[PDB]
Design an enzyme around this catalytic site. Structure first.
Site, mmCIF file in Angstrom:
data_model
loop_
_atom_site.group_PDB
_atom_site.id
_atom_site.type_symbol
_atom_site.label_atom_id
_atom_site.label_comp_id
_atom_site.label_asym_id
_atom_site.label_seq_id
_atom_site.Cartn_x
_atom_site.Cartn_y
_atom_site.Cartn_z
ATOM 1 N N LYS D 156 -24.869 -10.095 -46.323
ATOM 2 C CA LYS D 156 -23.993 -11.242 -46.103
ATOM 3 C C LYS D 156 -23.186 -11.579 -47.351
ATOM 4 O O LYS D 156 -21.981 -11.858 -47.274
ATOM 5 C CB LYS D 156 -24.834 -12.439 -45.659
ATOM 6 N N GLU D 182 -28.969 -25.179 -49.907
ATOM 7 C CA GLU D 182 -29.500 -23.829 -49.989
ATOM 8 C C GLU D 182 -30.171 -23.628 -51.341
ATOM 9 O O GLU D 182 -30.082 -24.470 -52.238
ATOM 10 C CB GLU D 182 -28.392 -22.791 -49.765
ATOM 11 N N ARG D 183 -30.870 -22.499 -51.465
ATOM 12 C CA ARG D 183 -31.673 -22.225 -52.651
ATOM 13 C C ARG D 183 -30.825 -22.144 -53.916
ATOM 14 O O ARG D 183 -29.712 -21.612 -53.910
ATOM 15 C CB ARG D 183 -32.451 -20.923 -52.474
HETATM 16 N N1 LIG Z 1 -20.359 -2.671 -48.150
HETATM 17 C C1 LIG Z 1 -21.516 -2.176 -48.645
HETATM 18 N N2 LIG Z 1 -21.567 -0.939 -49.188
HETATM 19 C C2 LIG Z 1 -22.714 -0.437 -49.682
HETATM 20 N N3 LIG Z 1 -23.887 -1.092 -49.686
HETATM 21 C C3 LIG Z 1 -23.969 -2.340 -49.170
HETATM 22 C C4 LIG Z 1 -22.768 -2.960 -48.610
HETATM 23 N N4 LIG Z 1 -23.127 -4.182 -48.172
HETATM 24 C C5 LIG Z 1 -24.449 -4.325 -48.430
HETATM 25 N N5 LIG Z 1 -24.953 -3.228 -49.026
HETATM 26 C C6 LIG Z 1 -26.361 -3.045 -49.446
HETATM 27 O O1 LIG Z 1 -27.185 -4.032 -48.824
HETATM 28 C C7 LIG Z 1 -27.876 -4.784 -49.827
HETATM 29 C C8 LIG Z 1 -28.147 -6.188 -49.300
HETATM 30 O O2 LIG Z 1 -28.534 -7.057 -50.361
HETATM 31 P P1 LIG Z 1 -27.926 -8.546 -50.443
HETATM 32 O O3 LIG Z 1 -26.421 -8.465 -50.362
HETATM 33 O O4 LIG Z 1 -28.571 -9.252 -51.610
HETATM 34 O O5 LIG Z 1 -28.457 -9.245 -49.094
HETATM 35 P P2 LIG Z 1 -28.206 -10.818 -48.869
HETATM 36 O O6 LIG Z 1 -26.902 -11.068 -49.579
HETATM 37 O O7 LIG Z 1 -28.149 -10.997 -47.370
HETATM 38 O O8 LIG Z 1 -29.390 -11.465 -49.539
HETATM 39 C C9 LIG Z 1 -26.962 -4.703 -51.029
HETATM 40 O O9 LIG Z 1 -27.695 -4.924 -52.234
HETATM 41 C C10 LIG Z 1 -26.512 -3.263 -50.941
HETATM 42 O O10 LIG Z 1 -27.515 -2.393 -51.465
#
Ligand SMILES: Nc1ncnc2c1ncn2[C@@H]1O[C@H](COP(=O)(O)OP(=O)(O)O)[C@@H](O)[C@H]1O
Ligand SMILES: Nc1ncnc2c1ncn2[C@@H]1O[C@H](COP(=O)(O)OP(=O)(O)OP(=O)(O)O)[C@@H](O)[C@H]1O
Ligand SMILES: Nc1ncnc2c1ncn2[C@@H]1O[C@H](COP(=O)(O)OP(=O)(O)O)[C@@H](O)[C@H]1O
Ligand SMILES: [Mg+2]
Ligand SMILES: [Mg+2]
Lengths: 512, 460, 173, 460, 73
Positions: D156, D182-183
């Site tokens: 997200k 939020e956190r």
């Molecule tokens: N567009 C993208 N390209 C490559 N990897 C992605 C992409 N979007 C998400 N990811 C992967 O998914 C992971 C989800 O982690 P994160 O963004 O921290 O989840 P959230 O934000 O929901 O907590 C990212 O760290 C990355 O490794």
């Protein structure tokens, strides 16, 4: 031991001379302000339902005349007010400007214009709260209101003076069906009114320009109470719209009115009632709420000519007026076993239930048979449509329940291959695109060609091209009869032969 | 003359102050000059200081506090007797059709005591209705109470209109119809049906339809019942139709909070069961005359356990319970035969053959209900070859319970059918024991006696 | 108890008494009404649900020593609200408000025996420096103190009693 | 000059008394010296006699009665304009980063009316976000509301960062991020991830987190919105992110309970649908600019009927669902194309070609969803020769939806792509109608326009 | 409870003392059959909970059995 809105300097004024009534009974002072509700001290002359005028240009509605203070609700932005503001009582019960000159304007719930086109050419004022015509002043609804839609005009006929609930889940064509009816009503002498209750302004602006495109706006009044606006405006808005429709009704004309969500009117009234600390009932709604919708919708009525004569002081001798209401209701997750939906189902005459499953599957408009009914029935229809469309909604009620039960296979194939192919062919035929209204002649010839078997064998699909060709072939050459049958609605074996001759000529010559 | 003053106005309720030596009694009427009209208040409570809480029998708007009010020293009184027959009346007993004044010689107070216990009478005389399910499942007697329970749009009014047509026209005595908080459209369509059938000379009409403020809806059932009581005391036997009794209690709920009474179980007034029993107990047959009555009883949100239905069920003798599920099938009359009952469905009153047919219909419809959950998960194929037979018969019974009505002759084109008690027990007894096992289910939908189903089977 | 209901009436009475330069008369008038409020027969009448107007007239009658402005208005306004039993507090609140505007404090002193009138005058001048008001000492002879004095100046208190020191020492152990 | 006195303190609710004539208005801001720190109070109600009931925008501990209160003659005012880009602020417009001070030229009150009816733009337009899945299956109306429903780990944050980047570089707008309830951990790591991606220079942040008194969590969304409104007046297109609107609803519920108002349908405040509409009605397109909004939504107990989801969905124009299954497949963004929804997929609104392309893609994927289940139990070779082809095309459509983001280079290294709407329409028309069948499915994975897919297949 | 706890069997000495002779050896008894109505078979209601807690036993009559024909159900 608690105080009762008696405070130091008002007690001091009473100390100066007990009979402060020697001052004017015409005015008072705000004593408290909370969430749009206001408490006023003084106003010995105030009467319940009266418009109270605030500084600036604002009004409050006197709801409570208590022992020493008036409780009211503010019809606008209330945050500008403060304690001690002088307040004057206009000696008028809540009244809205009304007249034919409102046609084509967009107005606030108070009848203040909201378009940029300047002041109103209203005829007079009329009370927002009124008691509907009595049992002896009614007349039976026996005239049609044709819509654009083949499904509703065949299954769920609407008549001048009827009340049709349009109930369904969110995003199922409730607005689309109502505004497309408003569009069809132009060039048929019946006026229309659209009351947007608790709607977001982008949508209201879209539908207003969409009514202006189709030329419908010159025929119709639009009343707008957007989602940002004070709850007193929202719940009062449908009564103002009814007060505008009632003028046409009492002058012996025809009007149609759409209340674009009674279920938001109910929430606004629940807010006002819980702010006034009234004990709530089921689903936290007040006990009043059924009276809220009933006194509003029973106003939509058809009145006999003696009532129009007695009202207009003789001036309009011998015409009968009507107001046709089509309230919209939104139900969560498709259940109608809910308090407010069942309240309005208990008040309105018919019921168009729009189903989400059909809507997703592409059956649009998603008129669910069996649940939907018209309690006026065939008396509303033109006799051609009455005779052609017969009992088909009950046939689909059983066709739907049986296709749901007999899921494993088409067993006991006595005539179910005909019955279920006919029910599929008809459901496919009732599907229609919005903003494409079909005249009664086109609906009648299509339903004639469907209902008595003449196409139950050919499950070709391709149906839309067959209809679009059929209505063009009859418009260009085959039928001067279109102008005749659109006028009379007559059903005759002579005309049946005329039309069946066209039907056989097209069905033989053209391979769909 | 005018001796009191308004001191509060909260919606429908009004507070009036009087000298402490002249305070009215607790059901007297009062009069106010509201603008130019005349408004009647009925006092509900005596508060302490010569004040009095009243309910307005009319629109409350326009009332100032400080108006003078005039103490009528008698309760609300309505015209009664022969004079009130072919006419429509207000809750205040005023004429509401455009004809002249009512020619009554006598007027009765609408608040009256129920008949004594030694004065009641009970009758076993079964009354026949054209309706297969109602008389088979829930047969009701002359002078008994019938109640029709249902949600919204299930058929209460169409069935009451069929009962009116099937009993009330081929009946000698006078009849009374009270519209309590229903549609004025349907009241007008009824009045014009009666006047165009020349039976209006026997049907007294009272209307307090859903456009009226709470006081009219609250009292209108009591003023209609007073006219029925007058015709009962003359020694006649009378029909009373009440088009939605639930609205009486609802108007009491709407008023209850303003009268300063703590709310109860689901919002209802604390006095729900007494308010209902004080009306319901005086609509009864006595040793001098009998009242046969049919009440529609709306059930809110289809919840049969809501306090108002639950407390209404005890009063009636025959309860017919309509359900939305069966109506969604299109099977009108949408009676639920597993919930409808009667006091009269006993073998000594009805006779053994009727009693056994009705119990067998209930037993196999209950067994089909018990099968439905396993039919829903697994499907029908898993059932025993016994279970499939009771399912097929229960479905054929559910179809044969349907019937076309002379009043529904405008919602469907089918002609209305009148089915005698003998023919309905003859058909249900025939279906149950399998002599019609060979016909399709559609042969039974919307037919009269079974000999019409055997004909419909030929045409598919 | 009804401090909270008496506050508005006391404030109104006082704020009116300074518009008409008669605080001193209003105080004795309210003291008269507060005494009439206590009688055993009048307290039976005030509990009785008479109409506020006639109960006010039945209260004006027993006190003719009253201004048109004071009795015949304040008593009627309090009767309309049914507040007459609050009069004993409307008095005290009134007094307090006065002492506030007049920059006065009713310091109370408590002792085992009389003070030398040099001790007491020193106390006056010292409290008038601790506070910012003209003090009005009143003494009490309470034997349980045994020696020293307690000085109470509202919610503030200074305890020099040997009993207080003894019990504090008792809790240091 | 201070003029008021604190008279009560009960939790976060503070009552202060003013002279009878100087009473503040409803949403004015007062302030108090709570020890050394100043404390701001937002008025909520005017009670009788000069008393005013307010809620503290801070910790209530340490407040005496009788403290002097100063009446500011205006509502809460916050800095606005370019000066706020890249900063972090709290509700009161104070820097909670430590970079010093905000050199704003102007300050705006957070409370104002929504745009007037004649002021709304008499047009309807799409927002090209540059992401294939969103642009195809759930287009954005310029000035619409959009819901984000995914959980955690689904990326997200990277979606929000890609949107923040594209709205600034390709368009010429700014962005506001309002994190309500939020956190603190997530806001800290989000700030670090945005500064490690050079997007911090283009977004203005406002935070009221879970550790904040109710009033902060209530008014932070209005602070963010009034900054977005100052960007709008300048003639720009703005993006406003609300990190959880459900927490805005829940803080309104808490404040309502503190003020002592009666509980509504499910315990929510009685003013729920007003408090929601007062926020969501300011997010509109105007004939000077526009604010589009992306709002993370949380559904209590997975109930889409609960009053909070039911009130929120009334306003949303589009709905994007994020699924962990799509991420386990290594497809990013992990947008679920079957449940993602927009009310702008109306063939009159977006055109017939786009509409039917989206419908075709959806039908293909929901056929593959069942063929996958058949394969999982019967094996690949049970599928007919036609199904094996729809599977072959589905597995390619499912991968052409993935995309490289300018901000995701730290993961995938790929330069990142901005895809125009018509180009993804072309590409999906191609793949869907059998063209491009002659290259392997891996030639579509993590690529931009379809010409880059054919060239990757060449290199492959 | 103070209604239902009045239904009791009473030993011969209480009867002999109460009547001041004139009865001996005999035991007195009062048996109570209260009736309760439940809404859709829910026992978790207030008054059903109290009365089910007070009495010495319960006869549960069910509509699913009564409809099937098991009477008394
Ligand atoms: N567009 C993208 N390209 C490559 N990897 C992605 C992409 N979007 C998400 N990811 C992967 O998914 C992971 C989800 O982690 P994160 O963004 O921290 O989840 P959230 O934000 O929901 O907590 C990212 O760290 C990355 O490794
Ligand atoms: N017969 C139809 N054929 C094709 N599309 C339709 C039809 N009727 C409505 N639609 C489309 O489906 C969408 C939903 O219709 P609409 O927004 O009027 O539903 P609604 O129930 O009024 O929505 P809401 O409940 O949010 O007010 C619109 O995009 C509309 O254009
Ligand atoms: N026997 C029947 N045939 C056809 N329709 C019926 C029948 N009984 C009831 N209905 C349908 O029930 C609907 C409402 O009936 P009504 O008596 O007004 O319901 P209620 O009064 O319980 O709300 C009508 O539209 C009517 O068509
Ligand atoms: Mg809509
Ligand atoms: Mg009905």
């Amino acid at each position: 031991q608690l105080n009762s809105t008696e405070i130091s300097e008002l007690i001091k004024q009473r100390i100066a001379q007990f009979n402060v009534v020697s001052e004017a009974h015409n005015e008072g002072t705000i004593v408290s302000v909370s969430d749009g509700v206001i408490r006023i001290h003084g106003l010995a002359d105030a009467m319940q339902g009266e418009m109270i005028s605030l500084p600036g240009n604002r009004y409050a509605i006197a709801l409570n005349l208590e022992r020493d203070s008036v409780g009211a609700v503010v019809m606008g932005p209330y945050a500008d007010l403060a304690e001690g503001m002088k307040v004057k009582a206009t000696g008028r019960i809540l009244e809205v400007p009304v007249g034919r000159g409102l046609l084509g304007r967009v107005v606030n719930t108070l009848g203040a214009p909201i378009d940029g086109k300047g002041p109103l050419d209203h005829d007079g004022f009329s009370a927002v709260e009124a008691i509907a015509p009595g049992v002896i002043e009614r007349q039976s609804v026996d005239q049609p209101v044709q819509t654009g839609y083949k499904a509703v005009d065949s299954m769920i006929p609407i008549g001048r003076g009827q009340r049709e609930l349009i109930i369904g889940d969110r995003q199922t064509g409730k607005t689309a069906l109502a505004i497309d009816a408003i569009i069809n009503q132009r060039d048929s002498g019946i006026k229309a009114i659209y009351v947007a209750i608790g709607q977001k302004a982008s949508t209201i602006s879209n539908v207003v320009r969409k009514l202006e495109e189709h030329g419908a706006l010159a025929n119709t009044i639009v009343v707008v109470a957007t989602a940002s606006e004070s709850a007193a405006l929202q719940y009062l808005a449908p009564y103002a719209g009814a007060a505008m429709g009632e003028y046409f009704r009492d002058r012996g004309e025809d009007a149609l009115i759409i209340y674009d969500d009674l279920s938001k009117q109910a929430v606004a009234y629940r807010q006002i009632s819980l702010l006034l600390r009234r004990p709530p009932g089921r689903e936290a709604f007040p006990g009043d709420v059924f009276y809220l919708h009933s006194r509003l919708l029973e106003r939509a009525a058809r009145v006999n000519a003696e009532y129009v004569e007695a009202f207009t002081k003789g001036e309009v001798k011998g015409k009968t007026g009507s107001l046709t209401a089509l309230p919209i209701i939104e139900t969560q997750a498709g259940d109608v076993s809910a308090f407010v939906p069942t309240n309005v189902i208990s008040i309105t005459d018919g019921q168009i239930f729009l189903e989400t499953n059909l809507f997703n599957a592409g059956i649009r408009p998603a008129v669910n048979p069996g649940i939907s009914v018209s309690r006026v029935g065939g008396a509303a229809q033109t006799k051609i449509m009455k005779k052609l469309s017969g009992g088909i909604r009950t046939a689909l009620a059983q066709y739907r329940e049986l296709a749901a039960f007999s899921q494993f296979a088409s067993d006991l194939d006595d005539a179910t291959r005909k019955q279920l192919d006919h029910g599929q062919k008809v459901t496919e035929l009732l599907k229609q695109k919005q903003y494409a209204p079909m005249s009664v002649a086109q609906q009648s010839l299509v339903l004639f060609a469907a209902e008595r078997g003449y196409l139950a064998d050919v499950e070709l699909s391709k149906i839309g091209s067959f209809e679009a060709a059929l209505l063009a072939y009859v418009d260009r050459d085959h039928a001067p009869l279109m102008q005749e049958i659109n006028q009379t609605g007559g059903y005759n074996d002579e005309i049946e032969g005329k039309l069946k001759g066209i039907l056989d000529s097209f069905k033989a010559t053209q391979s769909w | 003359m005018a001796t009191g003053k308004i001191v509060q106005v909260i919606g429908a309720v009004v507070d009036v102050e009087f000298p402490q030596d002249a305070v009215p009694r607790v059901y007297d009427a009062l009069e106010v000059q509201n603008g130019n009209e005349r408004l009647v208040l009925e006092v509900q409570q005596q508060l302490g200081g010569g004040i009095v809480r009243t309910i307005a029998m009319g629109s409350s708007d326009g009332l100032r506090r400080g108006l003078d009010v005039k103490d009528l020293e008698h309760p609300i009184e309505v015209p009664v007797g022969k004079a009130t027959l072919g006419r429509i009346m207000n809750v205040l007993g005023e004429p509401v059709d455009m004809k002249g004044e009512i020619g009554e010689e006598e007027r009765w107070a609408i608040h009256r005591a129920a008949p004594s216990y030694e004065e009641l009478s009970n009758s076993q005389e079964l009354l026949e209705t054209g309706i297969k399910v109602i008389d088979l499942m829930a047969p009701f007697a002359k002078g008994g109470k019938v109640g029709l329970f249902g949600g919204a749009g299930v058929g209460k009014t169409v069935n009451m209109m069929e009962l009116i047509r099937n009993i009330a026209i081929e009946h000698s005595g006078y009849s009374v119809f009270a519209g309590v908080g229903e549609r004025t459209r349907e009241g007008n369509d009824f009045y014009h049906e009666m006047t165009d059938s020349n039976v209006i000379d026997k049907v007294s009409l009272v209307y307090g339809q859903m456009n009226e403020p709470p006081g009219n809806r609250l009292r209108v059932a009591l003023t209609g019942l007073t006219m029925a009581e007058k015709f009962r005391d003359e020694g006649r036997d009378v029909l009373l139709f009440v088009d939605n009794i639930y609205r009486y209690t609802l108007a009491g709920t709407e008023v209850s909070a303003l009268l300063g009474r703590m709310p109860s179980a689901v919002g209802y007034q604390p006095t729900l069961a007494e308010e209902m029993g004080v009306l319901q107990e005086r609509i009864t047959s006595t040793k001098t005359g009998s009242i046969t009555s049919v009440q529609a009883v709306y059930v809110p949100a289809d919840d049969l356990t809501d306090p108002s239905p639950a407390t209404t069920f005890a009063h009636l003798d025959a309860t017919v319970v309509l359900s939305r599920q069966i109506a969604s099938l299109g099977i009108y009359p949408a009676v639920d035969p597993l919930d409808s009952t009667s006091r009269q469905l006993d073998p000594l009153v009805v006779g053994q053959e009727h009693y056994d047919t009705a119990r067998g219909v209930q037993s196999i419809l209950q067994r089909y209900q018990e099968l439905k959950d396993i039919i829903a998960i697994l499907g029908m194929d898993e059932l025993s070859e016994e279970d499939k037979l009771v399912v097929a018969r229960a479905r054929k019974i559910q179809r044969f319970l349907s019937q076309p009505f002379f009043v529904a002759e405008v919602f469907t084109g089918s002609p209305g059918k009148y089915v005698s008690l003998k023919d309905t027990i003859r058909g249900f007894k025939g279906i149950m024991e399998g002599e019609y096992d060979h016909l399709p289910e559609q042969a039974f939908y919307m037919v009269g006696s079974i000999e019409e189903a055997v004909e419909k089977a030929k045409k598919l | 108890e009804f401090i909270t209901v008496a506050r508005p009436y006391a404030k109104a009475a006082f704020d009116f008494a300074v518009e008409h330069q008669s605080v001193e008369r209003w105080q004795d008038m309210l003291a008269f009404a507060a005494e009439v409020t206590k009688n055993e027969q009048m307290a039976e009448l005030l509990s009785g649900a008479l109409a506020p107007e006639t109960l006010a007239e039945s209260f004006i009658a027993v006190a003719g020593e009253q201004l048109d402005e004071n009795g015949q208005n304040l008593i009627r306004v309090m009767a309309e609200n049914g507040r007459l039993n609050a009069l004993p507090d409307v008095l005290e609140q009134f007094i307090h408000l006065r002492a506030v505007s007049e920059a006065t404090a009713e310091v109370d002193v408590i002792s085992a025996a009389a003070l030398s009138e040099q001790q007491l005058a020193k106390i006056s001048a010292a409290m008038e420096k601790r506070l910012s008001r003209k003090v009005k000492l009143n003494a009490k002879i309470d034997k349980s103190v045994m020696a020293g004095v307690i000085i109470r100046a509202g919610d503030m208190v200074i305890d020099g009693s040997v009993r207080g020191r003894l019990e504090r020492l008792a809790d240091v152990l």
